[PDB]
Design a protein around this ligand. Structure first.
Ligand code: CLR
Length: 581
């Protein structure tokens, strides 16, 4: 009979000599030189050396597959046919010459019954139409998926259909367009006034927007007439993997270099910005030539490293080439680590900056408090009847004015000498009015308070109104740094979240995809043999919404840094260049 009784075990390898197996179970009973599937892989590795004889290899492939890795299903294994065995004797007679034929490979009808339907005869080892979606026939050995011969992994992402590709593409279109023209607006602002806007750290924003401009250029390069397929796909319609590979158009690695280098420089310029802010608050242009070197070297070294390990992969969905798609331990290495360190450092100099800021924010506010006390107490004194209120409020004025005088790089400067003298006059007159108030003389002290008013205006109002507008500037800086802080931290948190999700479930997504590939590989043979075919699908796939969020995060960063130039002071600068008369 064409069937033998044995226990079916799962295929440890779903490929038989470069050809996908349409079944999932096998048995090592027919392979009388093997007891386990590991042994089977060893013996087939021994048979592998016969591939240098295409004439024999072509004819011995189906026999070897039908014997060593047969289809087991429901406790039954199908034995290879007599004809199949006879198709091997004539061309592979060489095997009989050197070492002879194994007894289980001899065409004895007990091993190879006559007229038995075999599942392998349907399989074509040289793929004319064997290549089944998501695989495309490529004769280039650098594109072949795993060990499979003739078939390569298709270019377009086999996890998302066209209907999703168009969606994500128009999404990226919109966002990257907004970013490219916003960044272009910032650039144009700091460029038309290149003579007046070239200052630190105001030019650091210009550099950030420059980087995020180049990056968005790289992101938009995929929208030309047939450029996308030129960047993402190889010459044989298989997705570019492990780039840069030899003898392939550099249309991919260029885009990768653009996107990645521009991104990394664009996010190290953040650290430079925070440092520049801290040093600006702590007080200069002595280290202004050293920031460049870091911000251009580190992304360069990183990019060169990625090109050195050749881990540039092409994505049809995003429409670009980026690091660590296939191997997710590279994206976490070259994206999450630098961005993370950037977050740490920039955060450090941010909080340092707002500490250097908070230390003065309290001082100025205290001086203002003293002034407040002076004003309200003068309000009470000028308009009062009881001579106790005058004494009290004059004492309070004395305390407040004394406390204000005890404030501060040179305490011996002529300004500090003068400022304290005014409070000497004020405190003195306050004490005179105090002497008047103690003796019960109400209206005399009240009349001696107007002296305090005119003296307040003359000697104190100067420095006060000088340090009155600063509390607005300091608060504006504080709140805009609050903005930048709680925004950048948000973006980093979100992108770290997305990247971590993909990093988490990529271990399962590959499993699902592989199972799917095997399933459709079964469908291929199952169709052209009038056999019942099973519906195949992907068990689980990456969420498009997550990628949407990540893109929204990075492009959101690209937009939020372009918004910084959007001020009322900018709009008028444009007019100076061409207003004429
Ligand atoms: C004819 C001359 C050039 C020798 C060619 C050697 C190669 C092509 C062939 C000839 C005979 C073949 C062997 C025949 C018998 C066996 C025993 C089996 O359990 C393992 C495979 C093994 C070991 C084969 C390996 C491949 C083999 C060694």
């Amino acid at each position: 009979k064409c069937k033998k009784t044995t226990t079916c075990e799962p295929l440890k390898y779903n490929i038989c000599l470069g050809s996908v197996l349409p079944y999932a179970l096998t048995s090592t009973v027919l392979a009388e030189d093997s007891s386990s599937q590991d042994e089977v892989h060893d013996k087939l590795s021994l048979w592998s050396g016969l591939r240098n004889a295409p004439r024999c290899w072509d004819a011995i492939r189906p026999l070897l597959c039908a014997v060593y890795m047969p289809k087991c299903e429901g406790g039954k294994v199908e034995l290879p046919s007599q004809g199949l065995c006879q198709t091997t004797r004539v061309p592979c007679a060489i095997v009989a010459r050197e070492r002879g034929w194994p007894d289980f490979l001899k065409c004895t009808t007990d091993y190879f019954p006559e007229g038995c339907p075999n599942e392998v005869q349907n399989i074509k080892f040289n793929s004319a139409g064997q290549c089944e979606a998501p695989l495309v026939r490529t004769d280039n050995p650098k594109s072949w998926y795993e060990d499979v011969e003739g078939c390569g992994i298709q270019c377009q992402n086999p996890l998302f259909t066209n209907k999703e590709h168009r969606e994500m593409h128009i999404y990226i279109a919109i966002f990257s367009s907004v970013t490219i023209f916003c960044t272009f607006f910032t650039l144009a602002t700091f460029l038309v006034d290149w003579k007046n806007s070239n200052r630190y750290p105001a030019v650091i924003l210009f550099y950030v927007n420059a980087c995020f401009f180049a990056g968005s250029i790289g992101w938009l390069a995929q929208f030309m007439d047939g450029a996308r397929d030129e960047i993402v796909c190889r010459g044989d319609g298989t997705m570019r993997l492990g780039e840069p590979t030899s003898s392939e158009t550099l249309s991919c690695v260029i885009i990768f270099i653009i996107v990645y280098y521009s991104m990394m420089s664009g996010v190290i310029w953040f650290v430079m910005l925070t440092y520049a802010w801290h040093t600006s608050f702590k007080a200069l242009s002595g280290k202004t030539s050293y920031f460049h070197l870091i911000t251009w070297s580190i992304p360069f070294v990183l990019t060169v490293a990625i090109l050195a390990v050749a881990q540039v992969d092409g994505d049809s969905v995003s429409g670009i080439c980026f690091v660590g798609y296939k191997n997710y331990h590279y994206r976490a290495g070259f994206v999450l680590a630098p961005i993370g360190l950037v977050l740490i450092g920039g955060g450090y100099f941010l909080i340092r900056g707002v500490m250097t800021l908070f230390s003065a924010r309290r001082q100025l506010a205290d001086l203002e408090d003293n002034w407040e006390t002076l004003n309200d107490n003068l309000k009470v004194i000028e308009k009062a009847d009881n001579a106790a209120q005058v004494k009290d409020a004059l004492t309070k004025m004395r305390a407040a004015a004394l406390d204000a005088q005890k404030a501060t790089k040179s305490p011996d400067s002529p300004e500090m000498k003068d400022f304290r003298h005014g409070f000497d006059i004020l405190v003195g007159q306050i004490d005179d009015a105090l002497k008047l108030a103690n003796e019960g003389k109400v209206k005399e002290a009240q009349a001696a308070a107007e002296q305090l008013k005119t003296t307040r205006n003359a000697y104190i109002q100067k420095y006060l109104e000088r340090a009155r507008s600063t509390l607005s500037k300091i608060n504006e800086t504080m709140l805009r740094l609050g903005i930048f802080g709680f925004l950048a931290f948000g973006f980093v948190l979100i992108t770290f979240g997305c990247h971590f999700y993909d990093f988490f479930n990529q271990a399962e997504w590959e499993r699902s995809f592989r199972e799917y590939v095997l399933c459709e590989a079964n469908v291929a043979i199952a169709e052209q043999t009038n056999k019942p075919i099973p519906e195949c699908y992907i068990k689980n796939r990456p969420s498009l919404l997550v990628e949407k969020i990540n893109l929204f995060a990075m492009f959101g960063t690209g937009i939020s840094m372009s918004t910084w130039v959007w001020t009322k002071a900018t709009i008028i600068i444009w007019k100076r260049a061409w207003c004429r008369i």
